[PDB]
């Protein structure tokens, strides 16, 4: 079910010492790769430094991303006008049933999707004027179209397979959460219950509230990452003061054989 | 009685061009000097939002405060007929005045642009009138420009639309240039921008022939 | 096309006074990418704040993890301070112990 | 507060054509159901006159009486910038509301009419767009029609004016016909009527060429 996805970003006038362009590469919700226009080199992130990886893998990455850098910084020439720009791209692929890849290639300008890459016609598309401009600049190039094709239909899925084999260790990692449930006097005759999940991987996880064994739904959920690739979650609920000890909190998660009841 | 409210749409060019900002505005005049504070709200297809940006008090000669609230809507949004709203509440108003604006909804129609050169008769004189008829389009909102030799043109005017019998609208644009220029052959290109335009944009051309 | 940040502050491990931990601040859902995020100990900024790579989500909005190692004490108060184009003035979020 | 008043001009066609009646109208709404009677007056370049003709009460759904007074001005008159006036007095109004209308005065300019045939591109399809540009005229007021084969045409629309940089206005008119008709050669003639037109009228022609 997992997927290789690159998060390309360029800006037209960067705060100085900031990079004009940069990429983050992801395997599922793990960041494996990292690149930017200053350093100019694709580097492994996190536990992926220790991946049993082959020679030339990384400089293949670098080579590809440099073509991307050029393309992206080229886009702002095509747009012409003054006002600062932010060009984003989401590129990748996901494995499908029959030893089959499914590609993704969308882009956004100043925070709105506007352009895409049609893998059938081998053309960029989108119909905003901005997208027509950029689409045109790229389509008339040293076979930029072909390289995007190879990158998505060949390189991407070949990489994805390679990482699955050589990086099971990371991908299949499992860490169940530490749980805490607490009561916080809030209002007049009210109080806030907060269930919290600490340090878990993978990030799929649900929090639920019971009140004497019957569902009180969920309230506001919150979800986030820790420094170490693990995750954090919390859910909160309004509740009659003095009626607190009646509630508990239940948690579902891949790293637990069965759902956990969490007392106050 | 109390103050009144006026709710303006975004700029048609700004609703196609991302690079530009499509501002859905909320202007309230005839406001009480005594009770100046006003509580704006906003509702996207019913759902409230908190990305409003209120400009400060811009008082007039007529002792009435004038206040303005700008919402930066999305591009894609507006064009999907998402229904917006300005809920103004003031102590100078007993109840709240609500004003609901949108895209002029309905099946939009591809415009159809043709150029027309200056007529026989006209050419005699030093000046000419390069016509741009644009017909067969829905809706009203539409941007029209001129440009020559890769470079925009100033000397022109463009009539607003009128409703064509068929239900769609149409428009004209009278770019004037000097005779010499037109004779020299220089290619002129009437540019149009509109919702149903393929790529939200098309331009046509006009030259000696 | 212009989005305001969402600030979560939470510890990595359950908070226990006198035991070592990490404090995270997770700024998210903002646009454009320029953002100043500072972690505050008792109102003044920490200098050993590390932070993750600037990235973005399925919905194109940017996000970022700032984090510091720390050993909480009962007395100490922490907070996260964010400036961004869309903010009148620095927004400060207090680290609720419970969440 | 009380009722308000609106003062309309005559019809541009009616200000050139004698045979037609140029009616300078005085319409008052928001009138008190309690005090319905209203005392009109009229003043030609200051001088009062007694040839007014008041229509009776034409009440609306909104419980406000609507009253109307018609003055039949002269042809020659209006065009000499004679300044007219409706003085409405009602007990529902403390003072009298006075409204003064006239010809859009200033040095009037001869219009200049050219035809333009349907463009290359357009001809492909079954329908065509016989353009009539009319530019270089003052003032706004102006009548435009079509006529073919000695006989008027229905299928057309005409944009209102817009103010041309030079100070004069201009206009367009998009008479649509079928292709066959135009091909058969039938002569079409865009007709214009305006104050500064020689003989208050001119018409031009358009045909296969
Ligand atoms: C004190 O003075 C103020 C003005 O200051 C002036 O100071 C004096 C001293 C002198 O120097 C003047 O020269 C100065 O101008 C007064 O403020 C004004 O008040 C009036 C009414 O009280 C408002 O009138 C409305 O106007 C809008 C159109 O406004 C645009 O165009 C104006 C000039 O052309 C301009 O002033 C406006 O700013 C505005 O421009 C737009 O600005 C926005 C925002 O930035 C831009 O995005 C736009 O691009 C820009 N557009 C253009 C074009 O430039 C008009 O739409 C309103 O019409 C409705 O209301 C009528 C009654 O008032 C009604 O009869 C009509 O039917 C119409 O109602 C609707 O009609 C349409 C039909 O399609 C439908 O939408 C609806 O169905 C229908 N409504 C229904 C059915 O219910 C209206 O006339 C004026 O806008 C306002 N000024 C500004 C600015 O907003 C102040 O009132 C005065 N105080 C007192 C106590 O007298
Ligand atoms: C009860 O309802 C009445 C209407 O009935 C309706 O019933 C309801 C139930 C529903 O069924 C509706 O569908 C029905 O229509 C209300 O009566 C109306 O009230 C309003 C305001 O109260 C009047 O608004 C004015 O309108 C004129 C334009 O009116 C023409 O066009 C209308 C439709 O397009 C039409 O209704 C009119 O009849 C009229 O048509 C003309 O008729 C004459 C007479 O036979 C013909 O000769 C003409 O050929 C014909 N013309 C066309 C075209 O068809 C408009 O000009 C006014 O604008 C001024 O006032 C604005 C504020 O109201 C102001 O903001 C503007 O600036 C403008 O002021 C001037 O602007 C110009 C700029 O160039 C300059 O002249 C000035 O400088 C400037 N003034 C300055 C600076 O001071 C105005 O909007 C409406 O006319 C009226 N109906 C009729 C009929 O007259 C009734 O009010 C309501 N009661 C209550 C209590 O609510």
UniProtKB/Swiss-Prot annotation, chain A:
It is found in: Cell membrane; Endosome membrane. Residues 1-84 are annotated as: Alpha-1. Residues 85-174 are annotated as: Alpha-2. GO terms for molecular function: beta-2-microglobulin binding; IgG binding. Disulfide bonds join 93-156, 195-249. Keywords: Cell membrane, Disulfide bond, Endosome, Glycoprotein, IgG-binding protein, Immunoglobulin domain, Membrane, Phosphoprotein, Receptor, Signal, Transmembrane, Transmembrane helix. The keyword Glycoprotein applies. Residues 1-264 are extracellular. Glycans are attached at residue 99. One of its GO terms (cellular component) is external side of plasma membrane. Residues 176-263 form the Ig-like C1-type domain. It is a single-pass type I membrane protein. GO terms for biological process: IgG immunoglobulin transcytosis in epithelial cells mediated by FcRn immunoglobulin receptor; immune response. FcRn complex consists of two subunits: p51, and p14 which is equivalent to beta-2-microglobulin. It forms an MHC class I-like heterodimer. Interacts with albumin/ALB; this interaction regulates ALB homeostasis. (Microbial infection) Interacts with Echovirus 6, Echovirus 11 and Echovirus 30 capsid protein VP1. Cell surface receptor that transfers passive humoral immunity from the mother to the newborn. Binds to the Fc region of monomeric immunoglobulin gamma and mediates its selective uptake from milk. IgG in the milk is bound at the apical surface of the intestinal epithelium. The resultant FcRn-IgG complexes are transcytosed across the intestinal epithelium and IgG is released from FcRn into blood or tissue fluids. Throughout life, contributes to effective humoral immunity by recycling IgG and extending its half-life in the circulation. (Microbial infection) Acts as an uncoating receptor for a panel of echoviruses including Echovirus 5, 6, 7, 9, 11, 13, 25 and 29. Belongs to the immunoglobulin superfamily. This is IgG receptor FcRn large subunit p51. The chain holds residues 27 to 290 of 365 of the full protein.
UniProtKB/Swiss-Prot annotation, chains B, D:
The keyword Disulfide bond applies. Changing residue 2 to A: Reduces the affinity for FCGR1A about 40-fold. Abolishes binding to FCGR2A and FCGR3A. Impairs ADCC of virus-infected cells by monocytes. Decreases binding to complement component C1q. Decreases complement-dependent cytotoxicity. GO terms for molecular function: antigen binding; Fc-gamma receptor I complex binding; immunoglobulin receptor binding. Constant region of immunoglobulin heavy chains. Immunoglobulins, also known as antibodies, are membrane-bound or secreted glycoproteins produced by B lymphocytes. In the recognition phase of humoral immunity, the membrane-bound immunoglobulins serve as receptors which, upon binding of a specific antigen, trigger the clonal expansion and differentiation of B lymphocytes into immunoglobulins-secreting plasma cells. Secreted immunoglobulins mediate the effector phase of humoral immunity, which results in the elimination of bound antigens. This is Immunoglobulin heavy constant gamma 1. Glycans are attached at residue 62. It is linked to Multiple myeloma: A malignant tumor of plasma cells usually arising in the bone marrow and characterized by diffuse involvement of the skeletal system, hyperglobulinemia, Bence-Jones proteinuria and anemia. Complications of multiple myeloma are bone pain, hypercalcemia, renal failure and spinal cord compression. The aberrant antibodies that are produced lead to impaired humoral immunity and patients have a high prevalence of infection. Amyloidosis may develop in some patients. One of its GO terms (biological process) is adaptive immune response. Residues 1-105 are annotated as: CH2. Disulfide bonds join 26-86, 132-190. Keywords: Adaptive immunity, Cell membrane, Chromosomal rearrangement, Disulfide bond, Glycoprotein, Immunity, Immunoglobulin, Immunoglobulin domain, Membrane, Secreted, Transmembrane, Transmembrane helix. The chain holds residues 119 to 327 of 399 of the full protein. Residues 3-102, 111-207 form the Ig-like domain. It comes from the Eukaryota. The keyword Cell membrane applies. Residues 106-209 are annotated as: CH3.
From Swiss-Prot, chain C:
Component of the class I major histocompatibility complex (MHC). Involved in the presentation of peptide antigens to the immune system. Exogenously applied M.tuberculosis EsxA or EsxA-EsxB (or EsxA expressed in host) binds B2M and decreases its export to the cell surface (total protein levels do not change), probably leading to defects in class I antigen presentation. GO terms for biological process: amyloid fibril formation; antigen processing and presentation of endogenous peptide antigen via MHC class I; antigen processing and presentation of exogenous peptide antigen via MHC class II; antigen processing and presentation of exogenous protein antigen via MHC class Ib, TAP-dependent; cellular response to iron ion; cellular response to iron(III) ion; cellular response to nicotine; intracellular iron ion homeostasis. The gene is B2M. Keywords: Amyloid, Amyloidosis, Disease variant, Disulfide bond, Glycation, Glycoprotein, Immunity, Immunoglobulin domain, MHC I, Pyrrolidone carboxylic acid, Secreted, Signal. Heterodimer of an alpha chain and a beta chain. Beta-2-microglobulin is the beta-chain of major histocompatibility complex class I molecules. Polymers of beta 2-microglobulin can be found in tissues from patients on long-term hemodialysis. B2M alone (not in complex with HLA-I) interacts with M.tuberculosis EsxA (ESAT-6) and an EsxA-EsxB (CFP-10) complex; the tripartite complex can be detected in the host endoplasmic reticulum. The B2M-EsxA complex can be detected in patients with pleural tuberculosis and is stable from pH 4.0 to 8.0 and in the presence of 2M NaCl. Residues 5-93 form the Ig-like C1-type domain. Belongs to the beta-2-microglobulin family. One of its GO terms (cellular component) is focal adhesion. It comes from the Eukaryota. The keyword Ubl conjugation does not apply. Glycans are attached at residues 1, 19, 41, 48, 58, 91, 94. Disulfide bonds join 25-80. Its main location: secreted. One of its GO terms (molecular function) is peptide antigen binding. The modification Pyrrolidone carboxylic acid is found at residue 2.
């Amino acid at each position: 079910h997992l997927s290789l996805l690159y998060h390309l970003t360029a800006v037209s006038s960067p705060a100085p010492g900031t990079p004009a362009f940069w990429v983050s590469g992801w395997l599922g919700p793990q960041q494996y790769l990292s690149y930017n226009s200053l350093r100019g080199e694709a580097e492994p992130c996190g536990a992926w430094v220790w991946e049993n990886q082959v020679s030339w893998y990384w400089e293949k990455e670098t080579t590809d991303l440099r073509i991307k850098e050029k393309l992206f910084l080229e886009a702002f020439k095509a747009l012409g006008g003054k006002g600062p720009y932010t060009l984003q791209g989401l590129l990748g692929c996901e494995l499908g049933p029959d030893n089959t890849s499914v590609p993704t290639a969308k882009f956004a300008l100043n925070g709105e999707e506007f352009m895409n890459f049609d893998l059938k016609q081998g053309t960029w598309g989108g119909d905003w004027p901005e997208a027509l401009a950029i689409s045109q600049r790229w389509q008339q190039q040293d076979k930029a179209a072909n390289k995007e094709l190879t990158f998505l239909l060949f390189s991407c899925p070949h990489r994805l397979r390679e990482h699955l084999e050589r990086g099971r260790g990371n991908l299949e990692w499992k860490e169940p959460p530490s749980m805490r449930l607490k009561a916080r006097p809030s209002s007049p005759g009210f109080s806030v219950l907060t269930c919290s999940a600490f340090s878990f991987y993978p990030p799929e996880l649900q929090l639920r509230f019971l009140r004497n064994g019957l569902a009180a739904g969920t309230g506001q959920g919150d979800f986030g990452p820790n420094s170490d690739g693990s995750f954090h979650a919390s859910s909160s609920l309004t509740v009659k003061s003095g009626d607190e000890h009646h509630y508990c909190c239940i948690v579902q998660h891949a790293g637990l054989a069965q759902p956990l009841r969490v007392e106050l | 009685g109390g103050p009144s409210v006026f709710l303006f749409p975004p700029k048609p060019k700004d609703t196609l061009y991302i690079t530009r900002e499509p501002e859905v505005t909320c202007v309230v005049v005839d406001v009480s000097h005594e009770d100046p504070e006003v509580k704006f709200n906003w509702y996207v297809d019913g759902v409230e939002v908190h990305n409003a940006k209120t400009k400060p008090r811009e008082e007039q000669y007529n002792s009435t405060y004038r206040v303005v609230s700008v919402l930066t809507v999305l591009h894609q949004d507006w064009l999907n007929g998402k229904e917006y709203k300005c809920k103004v509440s003031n102590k100078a108003l007993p109840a709240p005045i609500e004003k609901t604006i949108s895209k002029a909804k309905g099946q939009p129609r591809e415009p159809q642009v043709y150029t027309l050169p200056p007529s026989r008769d006209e050419l005699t004189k030093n000046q000419v009138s390069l016509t741009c008829l644009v017909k067969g389009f829905y809706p009203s909102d539409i941007a029209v420009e001129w440009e020559s030799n890769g470079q925009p043109e100033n000397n022109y005017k463009t009539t607003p639309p009128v409703l064509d019998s068929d239900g769609s609208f149409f428009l004209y644009s009278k770019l004037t240039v000097d005779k010499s220029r037109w004779q020299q052959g220089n290619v002129f290109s009437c540019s149009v921008m509109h919702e149903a335009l393929h790529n939200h944009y098309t331009q046509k051309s006009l030259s000696l022939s | 096309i212009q989005r305001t940040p969402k600030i979560q502050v939470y510890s990595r491990h359950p908070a226990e006074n006198g035991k070592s931990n990490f404090l995270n601040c997770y700024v998210s859902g903002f646009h454009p990418s320029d953002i100043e995020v500072d972690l505050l100990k008792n109102g003044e900024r920490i200098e050993k704040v590390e932070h993750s790579d600037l990235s973005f989500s399925k919905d194109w909005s940017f996000y970022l993890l700032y984090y510091t190692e720390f050993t909480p004490t009962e007395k100490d108060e922490y907070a996260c301070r964010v400036n961004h184009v869309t903010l009148s003035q620095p927004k400060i979020v207090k680290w609720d112990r419970d969440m």
